Design a protein around this ligand. Structure first.
Ligand code: GDP
Ligand code: GDP
Lengths: 177, 178
């Protein structure tokens, strides 16, 4: 019954697009976002998905670009719509500072796996959105002080966003200067 | 850095059922919160049993789902968008509260995750326009799909659940139980 299509990105090595199946009828939809059996093999042995988070954001909010040295992230949108943008922040990568966009609609389920040293960002194109992500890492959670931040509009990255005037946290503003 | 926190209270009326309340960082952009960590919450289920399965149910207004359960699955349930009337039923025949129930009205204003042990009846009713229902499942071995689950009628008079309507939208499984 439960299934996952798993494709590697054609642009960024190590980034995977996971597409679950669902039971859909007129009443709504039911689906499995993760099982340990099918998806734990996306991260190397000894590192476990052990942390689930949600971000409720309003229209025109942009969060990013955030990353750290050890955390794998499995991300999606379970209500509304986001422009999810993954940035290659691995300095030893031949695609360093290239990016890939997924427009993730809660009607079309797509989970994106980001390895460590990748930049995570998203922009809310719907009225509200709910962003779900699982984190896999060893040891303590890497909070804001232990993360790096690239500016949402860094010209070296050149991300194509739907606006020039998003709503940004003070952290995400600070990175523009 | 606002630290990740969980308040954990046992239900005053159904032994073995826990109400988990996370903290949140709220600002003008919206909200960020942690629904689960292994470090804080794995101790809600006995040793050897792991939360290993995450599911979502997107439903419309007036949809009722339930009452579903099985012999071995622990469930950690909440609503991450909209509002549900979450109702837990004690389906443990040894229990002195067998077929009693407890309601939690769950939304982002009262962000609340409910832990159900095995042999408990899980149900919810969607009181908002749309809702997203998130739940984690902990169990050993294979997933228990619909044929290996029990079903009590949403309106079973022996249970006597107070729902906001007499005319919910029901799956054919949940109708069959009438
Ligand atoms: N792909 C997928 N299908 C699911 C999931 N959960 C439930 N279903 C399907 O939803 C269908 C309807 O569920 P339900 O009405 O409770 O039981 P049934 O009518 O007796 O099968 C079943 O065929 C399940 O296999 C899931 O996580 N993923
Ligand atoms: N309570 C809680 N706070 C969190 C969580 N995740 C992040 N935060 C906090 O949210 C705040 C805002 O993050 P952000 O604006 O991106 O970074 P900041 O501006 O440097 O604080 C920080 O203080 C984090 O510690 C969580 O799961 N729960």
């Amino acid at each position: 019954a439960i299934e996952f299509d798993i494709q590697e990105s054609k642009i960024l090595k190590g980034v995977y697009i996971i597409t679950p199946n669902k039971f859909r009828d007129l009443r709504g939809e039911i689906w499995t976002a993760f099982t340990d059996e099918y998806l734990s093999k996306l991260v190397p042995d000894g590192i476990k998905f052990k942390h689930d988070k949600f971000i409720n954001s309003h229209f025109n909010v942009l969060r990013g670009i955030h990353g750290d040295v050890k955390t794998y992230k499995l991300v999606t949108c379970v209500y509304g719509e986001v422009h999810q943008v993954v940035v290659d922040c691995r300095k030893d990568s031949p695609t360093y500072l290239k990016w890939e966009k997924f427009i993730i609609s809660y009607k079309n389920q797509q989970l994106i796996l980001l390895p460590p040293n990748m930049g995570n960002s998203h922009y809310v194109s719907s009225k509200e959105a709910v962003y779900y992500y699982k984190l896999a890492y060893e040891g303590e959670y890497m909070d804001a002080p232990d993360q790096f931040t690239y500016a949402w509009n860094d010209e070296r990255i050149g991300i194509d966003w739907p606006t020039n005037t998003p709503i940004l946290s003070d952290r995400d503003i600070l990175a523009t200067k």
